[PDB]
Design a protein around this ligand. Structure first.
Ligand SMILES: O=C(Cc1cc(-c2ccc3c(-c4nc5ccccc5[nH]4)n[nH]c3c2)n[nH]1)Nc1cccc(F)c1
Length: 234
């Protein structure tokens, strides 16, 4: 199947900065998202094949792709409920049942990814999307980076989960700092603290995910079978 622009109706922008559009496949009338990347803008600053070997309930599906002279087009699952980031601003912070449920969906997604030995880098709330039943979907830079990626993998996803849980429950990442260099010091020396409201089970989990020595971070199964997790997700 060789797709083209003329195959889809186009509506409003959804994304921004390296351009995704609401779209509709003209014949079946199916709503989806079209990412229009600029080749030139990439002869500047594959892998769409790793993405097409993937099928998971919490990874954004890639339905196909095409290109013309200047542009590469990705035909993507449209997440009707928007970004987790949007929801965090709307909600301020998430409850534990909601947080734990997102952590489980992430960690499932990440098992499967590691199982097809795909390893994602840093997950940020803006890269997390929300399906029609509000199930999560996966799709400066500092705040999410682990020590390894800043100082002098597969455990870097444990760290990401850990920043995320923290961000979900408190409404802020744990290393937010007045400056790029302060954040570097905080992350790099693992300097963060919890507001008093964060419960014991959540500290234990986040505490374990956020050790500086990777090989002391839990395994994905341990996150999945974590008592705070298995207690709180639906
Ligand atoms: O290149 C990008 C960046 C990117 C942006 C998006 C993106 C952005 C927004 C949406 C949306 C979407 N739904 C919304 C509803 C309300 C407001 C905004 C929304 N964005 N659905 N699917 C999306 C997908 N995905 N990926 N991802 C990518 C690349 C290759 C393979 C792959 F699986 C993902």
């Amino acid at each position: 199947r060789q797709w083209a622009l003329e195959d889809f109706e186009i509506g409003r922008p959804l994304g921004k900065g390296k351009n995704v559009y609401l779209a509709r496949e003209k014949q079946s009338k199916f709503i989806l998202a079209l990412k229009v990347l600029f080749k030139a803008q990439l002869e500047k600053a594959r892998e769409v094949e790793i993405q097409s070997h993937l099928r998971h309930p919490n990874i954004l599906r890639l339905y196909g792709y095409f290109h013309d002279a200047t542009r590469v087009y990705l035909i993507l699952e449209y997440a009707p409920l928007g970004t987790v980031y949007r929801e965090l601003q709307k909600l301020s912070k998430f409850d534990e049942q909601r947080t734990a449920t997102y952590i489980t969906e992430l960690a499932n997604a990440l098992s499967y990814c590691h199982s097809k030995r795909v390893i994602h880098r840093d997950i940020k709330p803006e890269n997390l999307l929300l399906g029609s039943a509000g199930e999560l979907k996966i799709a400066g830079t500092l705040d999410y980076l682990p020590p390894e990626m800043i100082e002098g993998d597969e455990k870097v996803d444990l760290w990401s989960l850990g920043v995320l849980c923290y961000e979900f429950l408190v409404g802020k990442p744990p290393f937010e700092a007045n400056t790029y260099q302060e954040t570097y010091k905080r992350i790099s020396r693992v300097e963060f603290t919890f507001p008093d409201f964060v419960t014991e089970g959540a500290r234990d989990l986040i505490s374990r995910l956020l050790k500086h020595n990777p090989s002391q971070r839990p395994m994905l199964r341990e996150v999945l079978e974590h008592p705070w997790i298995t207690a709180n997700s639906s």
